[PDB]
């Protein structure tokens, strides 16, 4: 009766990828809006740099979540990789939050 814990963690990583995709869409829409304002906006340069960093970090986390789905959480040889990748994703997701906090503040 216990869950297949790999299906659980895979499905979590799927939801995390889906939220990362929706956020990447919203950030790309916002970058489109910003670039249409151009240098007439005051915070143009730092806002463009913030969104650029956010998109690069999100692509990074998405590729991590691809590997967090490909490797099997039941496979003991992958535990070192899945642990490293999951701690790294926790880090990059924190930096993504902080950057989107500043993108919000300069919104």
């Amino acid at each position: 009766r216990p869950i297949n814990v790999n299906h659980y963690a895979n499905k979590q990583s799927a939801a995390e990828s889906m939220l990362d995709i929706a956020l990447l869409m919203a950030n790309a829409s916002q970058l489109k809006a910003v670039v249409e304002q151009g240098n007439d906006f005051a915070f143009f340069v730092p806002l463009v740099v913030l969104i650029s960093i956010s998109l690069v970090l999100q692509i990074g986390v998405g590729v991590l979540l691809i590997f967090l789905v490909k490797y099997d959480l039941n496979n003991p040889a992958k535990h070192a990789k899945l642990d490293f990748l999951n701690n790294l994703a926790t880090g990059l997701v924190f930096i993504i939050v902080v950057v989107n906090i500043f993108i919000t503040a300069f919104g």
Binding site: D72, N74, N75, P76, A77, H79
Partner: peptide, 27 residues
């Protein structure tokens, strides 16, 4: 998981092998 760890005079603990019996993945 079931596994085997070996310990010896003058050397550290080492994990020899590990398996998940329900899946047959091995280290």
């Amino acid at each position: 998981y079931v596994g085997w760890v070996r310990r010896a005079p003058g050397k550290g603990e080492e994990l020899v092998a590990r398996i998940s019996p329900s899946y047959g993945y091995t280290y």
